[PDB]
Every structure is written in structure tokens, then in C-alpha cells.
Amino acid sequence: PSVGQDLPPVGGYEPVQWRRNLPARGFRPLVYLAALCGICGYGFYRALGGIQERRELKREK
Amino acid sequence: MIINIVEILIFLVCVLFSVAYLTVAERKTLAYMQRRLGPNFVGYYGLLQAFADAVKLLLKEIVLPKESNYIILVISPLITLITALIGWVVIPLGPGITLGELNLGILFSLAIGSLGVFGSLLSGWSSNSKYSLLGSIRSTAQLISYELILTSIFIIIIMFVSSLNITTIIETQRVVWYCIPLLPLLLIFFIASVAETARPPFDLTESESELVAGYFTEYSGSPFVFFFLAEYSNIILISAFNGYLLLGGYLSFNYSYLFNILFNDYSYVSFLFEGLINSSAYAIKLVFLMFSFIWVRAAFPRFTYDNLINFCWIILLPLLFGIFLIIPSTLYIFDSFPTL
Amino acid sequence: IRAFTINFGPQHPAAHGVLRLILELSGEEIIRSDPHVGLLHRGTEKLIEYKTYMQALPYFDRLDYVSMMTNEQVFSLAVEKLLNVEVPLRGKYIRTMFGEITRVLNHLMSVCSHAMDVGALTPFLWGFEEREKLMEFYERVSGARLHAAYVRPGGVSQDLPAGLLDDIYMWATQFGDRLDEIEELLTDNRIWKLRTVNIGTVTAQDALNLGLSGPMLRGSGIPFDIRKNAPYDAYDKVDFDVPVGMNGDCYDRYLIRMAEFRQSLRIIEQCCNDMPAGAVKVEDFKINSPPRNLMKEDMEALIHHFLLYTKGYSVPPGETYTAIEAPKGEMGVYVVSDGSERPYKCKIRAPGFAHLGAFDHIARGHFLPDAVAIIGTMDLVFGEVDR
Amino acid sequence: MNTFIIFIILIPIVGFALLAVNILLAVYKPYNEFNQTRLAFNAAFILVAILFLPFDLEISTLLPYVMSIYLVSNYGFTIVLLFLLILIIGFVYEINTNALKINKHNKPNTDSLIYK
Amino acid sequence: AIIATAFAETVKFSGSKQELQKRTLALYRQFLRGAPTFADLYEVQFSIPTIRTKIRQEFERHRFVDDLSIQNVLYAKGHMEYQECINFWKQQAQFLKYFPEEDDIQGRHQPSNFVDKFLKNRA
Amino acid sequence: VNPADRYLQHVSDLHQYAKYIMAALPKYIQGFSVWKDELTLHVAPSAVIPVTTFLRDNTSTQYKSIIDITAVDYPSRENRFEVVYNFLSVRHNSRIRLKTYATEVTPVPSITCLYEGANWFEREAYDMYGVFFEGHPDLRRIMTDYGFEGHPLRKDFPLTGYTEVRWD
Amino acid sequence: MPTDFPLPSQQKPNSAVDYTLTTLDAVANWARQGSFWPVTFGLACCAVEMMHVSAPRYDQDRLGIIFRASPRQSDIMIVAGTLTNKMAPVLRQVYDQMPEPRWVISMGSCANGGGYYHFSYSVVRGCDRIVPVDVYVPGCPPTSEALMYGVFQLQRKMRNTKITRMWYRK
Amino acid sequence: SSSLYRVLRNAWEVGPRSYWKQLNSIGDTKSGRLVGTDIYGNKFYETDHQDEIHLRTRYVEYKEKDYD
Amino acid sequence: RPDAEKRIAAVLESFDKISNPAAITPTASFAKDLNLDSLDTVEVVVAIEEEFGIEIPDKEADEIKSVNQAVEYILAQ
Amino acid sequence: NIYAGGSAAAAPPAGFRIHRPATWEESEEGALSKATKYFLLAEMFRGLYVVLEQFFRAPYTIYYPFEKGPVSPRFRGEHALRRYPSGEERCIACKLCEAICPALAITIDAEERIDGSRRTTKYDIDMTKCIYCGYCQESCPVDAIVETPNVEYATETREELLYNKEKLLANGDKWELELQYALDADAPYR
Ligand code: SF4
Ligand code: SF4
Ligand code: SF4
């Protein structure tokens, strides 16, 4: 006979995940490049104007 | 005479007393980075353990190999330690608050980092085994080769400054940071930053598997606390360099709008709070950065030495000369030339 | 005139192994190598001729001490082929899926230990953690951890607990996330990809001439696996893809190991759904013990219970070579039966034995940090090679 | 009397207080406890430091320029850019000669099975 | 594993007693030449002519074997022990197997007659 | 069911191959035998290389790959040791076993001329028995003490050996 | 000198000097207890369990154990796995280049009295015959729980080291 | 988990004297329910709380400072 | 080389199994006159090359059967 | 059909001929887009984000002197000799435990005692070489030696490690509760 030992469910189990769970997250790489140039150029607009500002302050001193 | 000898002690317990808890903090991080608990048996929340490390380490012996000049194995620990400790003058801590202000800041800041190679080259010569010598060779060659680009971006930083005083840079940096215009500069600086320190994305040279049980010398004792503390001083020293000349040094925001709301007059409380917030902005940048070093120490394997020299001279450094051609040119397009 | 030739590791060069290994370096380039193995050499084969097959079984989970269960399995298979007996259906599936969770364990140790040997610290802990979860699953079935007094030459030692077959499914759902997670920082990984792109090329006919097998031979391109070429243990009755590499590099030998997790999990999905009912040991009481329920009640069960534990069971004379696919490689065993109850002789073919023997045909010209990435993907655990 | 000069002098004495503390605190100082012919190299070890000197040196050559860059408006630009454009092709000498290639003699035997 | 180690030879079986004798003579010359290397390498306590007077008497032990092929296995074992000692492969603990009698003078009451055997019932 | 029926149709197949082998090279095959689809071949000691070439080189018979070799003694008989070989046709998914014999004095030749990995295996079964492999570079002991004398897997040789170790 | 004197296992601090010496001893033993640097000797079926202690279930970094696999920085050595004839001089040599406040602990059943290979030919019948071992960790897969318990046993011995109290020669 | 909220709330549940003992005893803050005690004298606990990892549930509070 | 055979006699005298140290003539046979063995042959020849520090090939070592042939060989350096 | 000879059904399978590998121009993505992943280190920051995510999750480790890992009923650690109800030694010297301890850790002498029943005179395990086969548990008809799941018994001398009859009966006295608990979950599955 066979009683008391463990058995699978009569409905079975759910199917498991065995694949590569790899979402290609993020943006397009060109978006990273264009955002890079945007952050850069805005920084340069803050930088060089402040430098010319400092040069006029140097003149004033 | 009285108020300066306390001025140096408070800085000592600000730095030397902190670099130990840095070495506790790295264990706590890599614990939670690898899903385990940090040191918890030792102190209250498992703090303090660097004291238990050092005090035990001060109680072990001074066994010395027969092939080593013992004087040389005294000199190299001491000089590497004091090199990474006298690099601590013109870190700025708020406006103009250094240990000694001098108008040539970066030159000292950079020549002492230039002295930083000189101990590690000298160290492997003692105990003159062939593996022990050639390991010092392999270490020192990368240790100069990225010391190049570490040195070599410091000039393009001061192509916006044109002044060797370090605290001048931050007051220049009030209008905007330098990292946020010059973003890939930060990336190449961060890898150059972990290069000159013995960090294992890059420190292949501490391969015990390759050598006959050799990390550098296995020289241990109160010798061992010396190069060790020098290494972790080097860590947050190059973090400090990253802090001022690339990131917001002690700056957070304007904060005058807040002050005219709070105070009515200058007082020692006002100096206290402003020095607090400037030191805290410096602190928060520095403390995110020391975390980032571990955050890259965890996630990556080590290198081949071929990879390491290929990583210096072929992939990084011509891009650095491209920087040397674009930033004077961008300086040249507009008037834009900085004056002292 | 010769190179300044070194001793690689006395104690702790490669983790889990005493790798004394002569290297002759001319440019930090290995012109030739000579690994002296013998440092773990306990001489186990001289011992196993003096003990009964009954007793001779935990010699072999000591051998290859990161994948105990395949050694247990291959000796049980050699003796069952020798005895002309047949393990029942339930026994076939339970031995199969333990031999595959041990594969999960073996690659989970080996890939992460190799990543530490290279320098990647994070899988070296993320993998050993899930290995502790599998230590638990060895623990409920059989004895303690890491050395299972399990599959007997009659089949299986004993039944499961009442609920392991459930509980392992709760584990098996989350192993996929915990595996793709470590996949995410080693597979693309320009550092790892640089260090492992063509390092130690192994061509096809030279892979055959060096007698190599398992993931290495399947990495070189030859589609050969004992689970599907000369099947057994209902690996026929369980659907199972096999990965096969392209170059002879260490990167295929990496990627195939990453793939076999994904494969051996699918094993567990097709095993836990279709575990049958039936006798877990062999049917008779003449090669393994009767259950302790009825030996206190039956006169016949006692004499079997006594003779199997004084003499043991008698084996027909002959000799067999049974080799199965260990996760290290083809592990073989060559037993020569006296006809007595001690094995007259029993050779092992440890898989890493020829892997170590094929070292300096592969390791020529490469660098000394490159002489570490070659080590732990031929998997020199050194429990195998000497014995 | 300035704390600047105190700082570089006190730290060797701090290092001595950490140095002789082992000699005070230890015990059992030293108990009883082939290299015939070879040393091995490629040019890739010996060349990195030797080539490193002009590329380190040019930073200190470029260093007086960056302080005075406002004075040399639009012309010291031209001079220094000529200087750099000499040095950069001086750099791309070596990368085309592959001076830091440390190449391996592990060749897969290119030559085929020409027979009979 | 195409290539050998430094001193290892392909084993080959001399067809004549004379060719075996030639190989053994060359072999004793190899031991005798490498003997001052051994005292440096294995860091031994004693002197080089003691090594030499052992290497002589060990071949004196097997001077009087008749067979060709038993001297052939004997030569192969001798060549392997040469192969071990010429490298670092033996260690000095394993190297000092060959002098049990030198390092310690035996001890009191080494049994010689019947009686000294008998009083400790032959040890 | 008796677990031998599933072999039988193949086993009776295998014999037709095996007889063929004896018809192929009658100079060197003393005999063949098989027992539950393990084909075993019977080769004189001075006869190894001409068989192993044919086992490697034939298109119908390409085993290409040593798996494991070792020795087994039978001190009851005159030729004392016997040397066993295992191969694996990875094309045709088959195995083959080659037994020769050798007294402790006399050799067997080395198959290191063809099979490259086998030189390691031959290095093993040297030390365990004393059985030689003529024509073999790097013949020396392995997986034993360097200063060891005797051979472990030898039925006269005792279990604990002769010498034990302690730190004087 | 007194004819009766309390044993050093039985003595209590009574002089203020003894309170000072005992607290200083506690600090020294305490730094020796917390910071705790063994050396990776492990070689066999008894080495994966050493790595199982480094695993994230039974952590040793929370105990302060870390494997500086360099015997000059090591406080102690964990002999783990079996011990063969061919290795044993290397074991002695690794014991030699260790600093003086040392211990050694015998993880594994083969490492004490031979274990499962007690009757082999090329084996050392336990590492008693090489190094003086102070704590044995039994268990043939000597349990991580048991290995840590062996470390705690050794740390209790470390608490009873009395390096300071013996200057008064108690 | 191991967040600040959990350790704070369990310290606020247990009581600061037992907390000050427990922090010198273990590194954690753990709030059980006294399932039972020992014949040697050792107070045990068991944790209901939902934010617990596997096999962190039950634990000992010893008696002796020199425990093991 | 003058007085080289004096040094050869000085090395040759230091052995045993020599019934007459004054039988060291420049024409002394090793096996016959000196009463030596096949092992004594390479013993004295290696002692000679060690006395000079020079190294010798195998056949030129093998054929030296008398000290006359040693003084014949000696001017290879 | 008929095969050739040297010819099974093991032909190379359908489409075993691998594609000619793509060159620089047989690539779908732009060189600018490819080199964005080159310089800006996409798969570097990706795994950096992985380990950052693991920073903000739970650890696993336990406080070992305060928390213990999983223990099966069929776990094995040190030994003990059970006793009967109303306290009788339960070990007869069947010597099966001597017969199948594959390291020969068991050593027994035994004599007929006063009342005439067989009992063990000296029962001795060499715990240096008790290899935790657990076969010694499965070899007792009267179920006398068992596997106590204690592992925390680390000694300081080899002398302490020779368990004679008295230590094992003391362990059977001590762990009697847990051995009852374990056999109430294992005696079916034995
Ligand atoms: S303790 Fe156990 S696993 Fe370790 S060496 Fe001994 S027998 Fe092997
Ligand atoms: S578990 Fe212990 S008592 Fe049982 S056979 Fe093994 S060593 Fe002997
Ligand atoms: S415990 Fe069992 S095997 Fe051991 S002596 Fe008693 S009855 Fe026999």
C-alpha cells in the first residue's frame, strides 16, 4: 500500500519562472546623450556668464 | 599659541577619530550590500570595533623577515602614514577655514599625493623576494599611471579658476558647480580616484593567490596599522579632493534668505550655525562619496594588469587630451578667460 | 636558464582546495606549468577494498565535497547495474531531483567561488545564502548537512518528510529572481567580459584528446551529455534542454553554468508536479534493510536486518564502469566485484582529474591573473583529483 | 608659532608615539622563524614609467600657463595649442606602434593541415 | 601537456646490461654533481661529503642484482628520486628521510647479545 | 521486470560489432567479451598502440577520448597486474574497454603518443601499482608522499603502511 | 612567602592594584576577543563549512571574524579538513610564521585523531601530532553552529587568558 | 526587516530597563511573549511581528553573563 | 698547465681505498693502478671538475680511465 | 535509408550550421548609440543599481547564541544511549554498531551480568572518528544508541572526546526529551 507519504497536489503546482527576467529598462541611449549635452550646455551658460561677471568684479576692485 | 594647539587637536579628533569609524562603516555597508548584518557583537550597536582592531594589533609582535632591512620596514609605514596625514592642511572647511591658508593650495594638495606613490614603491623592496619585488613593480606602475590623470585634470579645473588657492575655487563655484557642467569628467575622475587608492576594482596587486602568501609584505604588527590607516586616510583624502574641485565643496544653497529671517545681528551663535551648515554640506558630499567607493568596491571583479595599463594609456588618456582641446577652445569662443 | 618558478598556493590561493602548482613565468607568461596534486590524497581507494558496500558508501560524499549527491548516485548506479536490480519509480524521481538540486548547489558554489577568485565579492555571498537554503533541504531528507548518508546501492535510504515536496516549491519560485539577480552583474559586465572573452581556448579535437567532459566539452561545441546521450533515472521522463557553447573560451564555460540553473529549475518544476507514489527503497529485503516497523514483528526481517549489517549483501562477480554526468563533468567509477561482499577493487574517475591534467595544454602563454580565471572554471575542488 | 608649521612637525612625533608603542607593548621579538638564476620582463613593465616622465612633466609645463591664462588672451592660446598639438601626435606615435602591447605567444596555430 | 619538466626524461628501456650500466654511471655523476646544491636547498645541518658517502653506499646496496629489468625498475626509481631532489618538490622534512642514523646517536642499551634482546623481549 | 531485457536487443547487436573487431585486427586481439553492454577487449602487452590507433582512426570506430585507465592486480596468476582502458566515442555514443596484462617487472607501452590527457592518467597508475608506461615523458610519482617507497594498491602492502608522522 | 595561596583559577581582586590590573586585562582580552583574525587553512569537506560561516546565514563579520589569508596577520589558525602526510610540513611552516599570542582550533573530525582516515597510510592521525591545538570542533560536517560554538568556547578561554594578572605572578 | 521604525517601536514596547539589558546582551530589539522558562532558568520568547525574516522568530534571554 | 697534476694528486690523495698514495704517478690507471671501481671513476672525475669549477660533458667524463687522460683533458679551459 | 558506416542517426541536426557572425555593417544600431553604451557604462550602472537595491532590503543572519537555524528530526550530532521506561539501559551488545561503523569508532566488551541478562560492560565511541554516518543509529534493533541533535559539545582535550558508557548514558539521561520528540517524527520514516 501507500499512505501518509507526501504527494503533489491533484491540481498540480503553478508554472514557475525559469527564463531570463531581463527588462531592457531605461531610455534610448540617444536620450541619455541629448540629456547629457543639455545638462552640460546649461552648466556652461551658468559658468561662463559667471566668469565674465567675476571679470567685471575684478575690474571694479 | 594656546588657541592653535587646540585648533589642531580638534581637527585630529575630527579626522583620525573618524577614519576608524570609516573602516567600521565599510563593513556595515558591505553587510547590507550582501544581505547580512554588520558588526554587532562588539559595541552597543556594534560600533567602536576599530579600537578593538587596533588595540589587539598593537599587542601582536614585531616578527621581521630575515631578508628585510628592518629600518626600511620602519620608514615606509611611517612615511606612507604621515603622507596621507599631512595631506590635511588645505582641505577647506567652510570659507577660508583650513589648517594653514596659503595661496598655493593645489600644488601642496597635489605634490603630497605625488609623494603618495613613494612609500608603496619603497615598501616591496624590503624582504627582497622576487615575487615580493615584482609585485611592488606592478603596483607602482599603475600607481603612477593614474596619478597622471589625477594630476592632469587638476589643471582643467583651474582653467575656470586660474588660482592655486583652494578656497578660491569654491567661491568661484558659488554660481554653479563644476560637476554639473562637466559630467563625464566626474566619471573619469571617479575611476581615477579609486585608482590611486588601493581599491579592488583595480587593486589586483593584493593577490594572495598569485604570491607566496603575499599581499604586499605581510609585515604585520603596529607596522600593520600604519599602511592600513594610511590607506583609509587616502580614501577620504581623495574624496576630499573630489569634494572641493569637482563637486559642491562646502556649498548647499544661498541660505542668506533663511538667515535674515532668523538672526537680527552677527553673534557667535550665527557663526556657529553658518560654520555648521557649511561643514555639513561638505560632510554630506564627503559622506555620500565614501559610500560610493564601497558601492563600486562591491559590484565588480578585479582586473588583469594588461587591462590596467590598457585602461590607462589607450582608453582614458586620449579622451583626456580631447578635453585639453575642447575646454581651452570653449574658453576661446567666448571671452570668458578667468582672472585670479 | 629556467624561470624563477613559483609555488602558487600552499594554503589559500584558490578557495576550497590546496592548489600547489608550479608555474614557469617568462613575461608573466606561462611557458609551462606543473601542478603537484596529492596534498589532499588520503588514499581512499586502499580503504574501500576493506569495507563492505554497505559501509563503503560514505567514502564518496567525502569525494567531491561540493556535489556529494552525484557521487552517491554514481556509486549506487554502478552497484545497481552490477547487482541486476531495479530501483522503483518513486526512487528514480527522488534520486533524480536530488541529483539536480545538487547540480544547482554545485554551480551555485562554483560560479560564485570563481567570481570571488576573480574578485567579484557579491555572488560569493548571494550564492552561499541560497546554498544554506539548500542545506536545509538536505537536512530534512537525510542526515545533517553537506554529507548525506543517502542513496544506497539498493536505491534510496528513506522517504521524505511529510511536506518537503510542498516546501521546495515555495523555494523554487523565488530561486529564479535570486538567480537572474546575480546574472545581472556578471553576464554583460565589461570587466568580466574583458577578463573572460577568449581566455583559455579549448578546441574540439583537443578537448577530446584531453578527455574532458561536462560543461567544458559542451562549451567547446560538442553536444554531449549523459543525461540525454545514455539516459537513466527518468531524465528520459523529464523534459530538459541542454546548453551548448560556441567558442572554446572560458566565457562559454561560464554561460553554460549560468544556463544550467535555468535548466535544473525546470527539472524541479517537472518533478514536483509528477512525483508518483510507491516504495522508496528497493522492493526486497535482500540488498537493503527492511523498514523498522515490521522487523520487530517478523522473524524473516530480522535475519536480513542482521546479515546486511554484519556481512552485508553478496554481489555477483564481474566488473562495471558506470559514468554519469556530474556537474563538474563526466564522473566515472570502475568497480571490480570479487563475488565477496567487499569490492575487490574500485577506481573512481574524478572529473577534475583530467581537468587538472589538461591544465598546461590550455594555460600556455596566458598571464598570471589569467592563471586564476582558468582555475575555477575547470573546477579544481581538489577533493576530487587526488583521493 | 603658526599652526601650519606646527602641523607638519607634530605628525612625525605622533607617528613616533604610534611607532614605539609596539616596542613598549610587545614581547618575544624574533624567534628562529631557490633563487639561483632568472628574472623575466617585457617592455611593457619597463616602458610605462620611462614614458611616464614626459607626460608627467608636461603637466608641470602646462601649469604656469593656466595661472596666467587671462594675460595671454587669444595668443598664448595659440602658442600653447601649438605645444599641445605637438605633444598629442607625440602621444599617437606609441599607440600606433603599440608600445604597451604585452602580446601573448599562445597562438592557435594559424597554419592549416597542408598534407602530402 | 605536450612538454615535460626540466630534468624529466622519456622512460626508455635499455636492451643491454652495458647500456643500463652507462645510464647508471651518468646518473651517479648527476647526483654527485648536484649534491652541493642539495645542502643549500634543503638547508641541512651537516656537510656535503656525508651526502656523497650516502649516495655511494646506496648504489653499493644494489650493486649485486643479476637481472636486466629489475635493474631497469631500480634505475627508474633512482631517476625519479633525482627528479625530486633536483627541484623543490621534496621538502627538507622529506629530504631528511635518508639520514635516520646521522641526526641522533641511537640511545642507551642498543641490544646486541641474546640477553639485551631478551630483557626487553626483542623490543 | 528483470532489468536486463532493455539491454538485450542492443547487447545482441553489440556482439556483431565485437566479432567484427576480431576479424579486423586478428594479430593483436586475444579475445573479446561483453557483459551487460560493456564491451571488453583482450590485448597482449606489446600490442597496445596498433589497436588504439585503429580505435581512434577508423570512421566506423572512432573513440577519440580517453576516459580513465587504471590497473587491477590478481596475484594468484602469473602475469600479475592487468591494465584497463576506457574510451568514449562521442560521435556514436559508445564505450569500449581495453584490457592488457603486465607483470610488475615488464612494461606496457604508453598511449601518450596519441591520447594527450592520458599522460596524466598513466602518471597516476604508475604510483599506485608500479606498472610502467614505456615511451612517456614526465613519468614520476603523484598523489603520494614524495619519499614514499612501495605501492599502495598492492595486496601484499599493508593498510596503515610502514611510516607514520609526528613533529619531533 | 605564605604557605597557603589561592589558585589563579580561584582568586579575586582585593587590592586596588588588582582592580586596575583586572580592568586593564579585561580591555586587552576584550580587544583580543572582538577583533579576531583566523587564517584560511581549509582544504577539504571541512572547508566549505568554513565558507558556510562566511555565508549570510551564520555571519562571522558580526562576530568580528574575518579571514586575512596571510599568516603573519593571523591571530589563530583553523585546521580544517583532513591532514595528509604530503602536506604536514607545510602545516608546521604555516604555524611557524604566526605571531606569539596565537591559538589553533581543530575544526573537523579528520583533523583530530585521524577521523575517517585513521587507518590510511598517507595521513596524519589528527593534527595533535603537528601543532598544539586548544579547542577541537567535532562533527564530520562540523556544524556552523558547532564551529561558532567552538569559537565562543575559545573566546571564553580568551577571557581567561590573564596576560596582565601574571605580571603580579598570581 | 531592519528599519529604524521597527527597532524604535519594539524598544518602546518592551521597556527601557529590559532594553538596556538587551542591548548589552544582543544587538537587536526583540519583543516576544514569554512562552516559557528553563529549569536552569532562561526566559524564552516568540515573535508575532510581521516584519521578521525567516528563522528570526524565537529566541533566548539567558541568565548568566557568561552564557553560551 | 704546470703543477696542475700536483693539484690533481692533492685531490686524488684525499680519498680512501688507495693502497699507496705514493702510487700517484702521472700514468696511474684508475681501475688497475689505483685499484678503483666504476663508481670511484666518476667520483674522482667530479672531484676534479669541482676542484676547478669547470663543467664537463658526459662522454669526455666517461672515457677518462687514467690520470694521464685527465691531464690530457685538463687544457680544455 | 541505409546509413554509410561510421554513420548513425547522429547526423548534425537541423540548422547546426551557425550563421556567419555579424560585422560592423551588419549591425542594426548606430555607432553613436553603440558607443553611448560604451562610454557611459550602461551595464556598469545597471549592476550598481542592482546592489543598491540589495542595500535597502532585509539581511538573513541570525544572532547565533540567541537564535538557532533549522534542525530536522533526522539531523545528527553527538550520541546517547536511550533507556527503557522504568529505566533500563536498553543496549544489548548485538555489536551491529561495532559491525557497521565504517570508521570503527565503536568498541564494546560485554558480559553476562548477575541476573543473567546480557548488558554491555564497556561501550566506547571514539568521537575523534565518529563520522556521523548515522548508520549506528539505523543498526540497533532495540534502538539504544541514537543521534542526539546537539552539536555544541566542543572539547579542549582529546581525552574528553573518548565517550565511554557513562558519558553516553548521561547524554541519554539529558537529551531524553528531545530524543522522544525526534523519534515521534522519525520512527514512521525509519
Ligand atoms: S571532518 Fe569530515 S568532511 Fe572534514 S576531512 Fe574529516 S571526514 Fe572529511
Ligand atoms: S555515525 Fe558514529 S557511531 Fe554511527 S557509524 Fe558513524 S562513526 Fe560510528
Ligand atoms: S546500541 Fe544497538 S548496535 Fe549498539 S550495542 Fe546496543 S543494540 Fe548493538
Coordinates of C-alpha atoms in Angstrom, one line a residue, chain I residues 7-64:
Chain I
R7 CA 96.7 19.6 -7.6
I8 CA 95.2 16.5 -9.2
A9 CA 97.3 14.4 -6.9
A10 CA 96.2 16.6 -4.0
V11 CA 92.6 15.9 -4.8
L12 CA 93.2 12.2 -5.6
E13 CA 95.1 11.6 -2.3
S14 CA 92.1 12.7 -0.2
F15 CA 90.1 9.5 -0.8
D16 CA 90.2 6.1 0.7
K17 CA 90.6 2.6 -1.0
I18 CA 94.1 3.6 -2.2
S19 CA 96.7 1.1 -1.1
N20 CA 99.5 3.5 -2.0
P21 CA 99.1 7.3 -2.1
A22 CA 102.7 7.4 -3.5
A23 CA 101.4 5.3 -6.4
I24 CA 100.1 8.5 -7.8
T25 CA 102.2 8.7 -10.9
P26 CA 101.2 10.8 -14.0
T27 CA 100.4 7.5 -15.7
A28 CA 98.2 6.0 -13.0
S29 CA 95.4 3.7 -14.2
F30 CA 92.3 4.3 -12.2
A31 CA 90.9 0.7 -12.1
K32 CA 94.2 -1.0 -12.4
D33 CA 97.0 1.1 -10.7
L34 CA 94.9 3.0 -8.2
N35 CA 92.7 -0.1 -7.5
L36 CA 89.4 1.8 -8.1
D37 CA 85.9 0.9 -9.1
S38 CA 83.5 2.2 -11.7
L39 CA 81.9 4.4 -9.2
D40 CA 85.3 5.7 -8.0
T41 CA 85.9 6.8 -11.5
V42 CA 83.2 9.4 -11.7
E43 CA 83.9 10.1 -8.0
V44 CA 87.4 11.4 -8.8
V45 CA 86.4 13.0 -12.1
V46 CA 83.6 15.1 -10.5
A47 CA 86.1 15.9 -7.7
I48 CA 88.5 17.2 -10.4
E49 CA 85.9 19.4 -12.1
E50 CA 84.8 20.6 -8.7
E51 CA 88.4 21.5 -7.9
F52 CA 88.4 23.7 -11.0
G53 CA 84.8 24.8 -11.1
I54 CA 84.6 23.9 -14.8
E55 CA 81.8 21.6 -16.2
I56 CA 82.4 18.7 -18.5
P57 CA 80.2 16.7 -20.9
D58 CA 79.3 13.1 -20.5
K59 CA 81.4 11.1 -22.9
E60 CA 84.5 13.1 -22.1
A61 CA 83.7 12.3 -18.5
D62 CA 83.1 8.6 -19.3
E63 CA 86.4 7.9 -21.2
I64 CA 88.9 9.2 -18.6

